[PDB]
Amino acid sequence: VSKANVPKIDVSPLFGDDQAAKMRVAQQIDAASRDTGFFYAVNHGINVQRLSQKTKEFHMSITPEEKWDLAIRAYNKEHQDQVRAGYYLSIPGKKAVESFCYLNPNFTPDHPRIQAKTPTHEVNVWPDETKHPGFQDFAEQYYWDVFGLSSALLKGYALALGKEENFFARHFKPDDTLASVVLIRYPYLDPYPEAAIKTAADGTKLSFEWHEDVSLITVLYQSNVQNLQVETAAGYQDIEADDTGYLINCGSYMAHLTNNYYKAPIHRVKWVNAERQSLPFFVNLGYDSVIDPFDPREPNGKSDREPLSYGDYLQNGLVSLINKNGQT
Ligand SMILES: [Fe+3]
């Protein structure tokens, strides 16, 4: 198995006003997006040591009673309103991964999309503050820290495609973003449950099968354990780990709106028996956000693809991913 070319891109100019330096970043984003589809964003300004430490304290200290109390509807029939946000339980002996997902902290009972019961909008559920002191404060802060980094990255993608820098970012707003954070624990287990290991067509043992992401872009922190592979025409290639950068790739909404010029890379997660964290932020727009598709290869940029509203995309895509790759 060969190793993927995943460049490290200093994204700090995207936070500044040196326009030529931003264009040089945009060129590197373009190059990576047309190659394997992944790059590492470095010099991003996020305290990832604190993120990993606070996430570890939570996963290691939550008890079965609290997991049932936070569980999404797939694990607790009482929680019919929790399809996205809450706890995703492991099943001892059968399913190793567990996770906690949370949404826009601005989704409160006062929010009009919550009042209207619009699909994909939910109010977050949190553990008891006295059992997990500071966790909710940390997690909400982190949402806005990574929102800020993601907004800068979206300026880079816009410039890479020849658009003005707010072309995507204008639809990525704190009042309505459908973006989510997932705090995923992959545990060390001895013996490791065989039901939790999938065998790929090529014989590789996997924790999660091939998929394209349901996102505009995905902004991922992981601990320093190699696990991801990206598909190329010559087979799967290993993505090297780096626990000081964010790994970035496009989701299928970007592929739709660029007429596949920036593909959503197909990737999968190898089985590794090691305690590790995977903390994705899925950059989603608002429920009604629509971007007119365009084709960067054409002089006129004209595309015959239908505009697709982000909410309908996300509703359909999340369900499809569960059906194909399993309840997580
Ligand atoms: Fe993915």
The alpha carbon of 314 and the centre of ligand 1 are apart by a number of angstroms equal to: 14
User: Annotated catalytic, 208?
Assistant: yes
Residues around the ion ligand 1 (C-beta < 5 A): 213
The arrangement of strands across the sheet holding 228-232 comes to 198-199, 205-211, 267-270, 228-232, 235-238
Name the DSSP letter for residue 261. Answer: S
Catalytically annotated residue among 213, 256, 281, 282:
213
The arrangement of strands across the sheet holding 98-102 comes to 8-10, 38-42, 246-250, 217-222, 276-283, 180-186, 98-102, 86-88
Q: How was this structure determined?
A: X-ray
Q: Give the chain's count of helices (H) and strands (E).
A: 7, 13
CATH of the domain at 136: 2.60.120.330
88 is in an annotated binding site: yes
276 is in an annotated binding site: yes
User: Annotated catalytic, 111?
Assistant: no
User: Annotated catalytic, 213?
Assistant: yes
Q: Given in angstroms, what resolution was this structure solved at?
A: 1.5
Question: How many residues can be counted in the chain?
Answer: 328
* Structural element, H or E, at residue 38: strand 38-42
Q: Which domain holds residue 322?
A: 1-328
User: Annotated catalytic, 267?
Assistant: yes
Identify the bridge partners of residue 237 per DSSP, sorted by sequence position.
Answer: 230
Tally the domains of the chain: 1
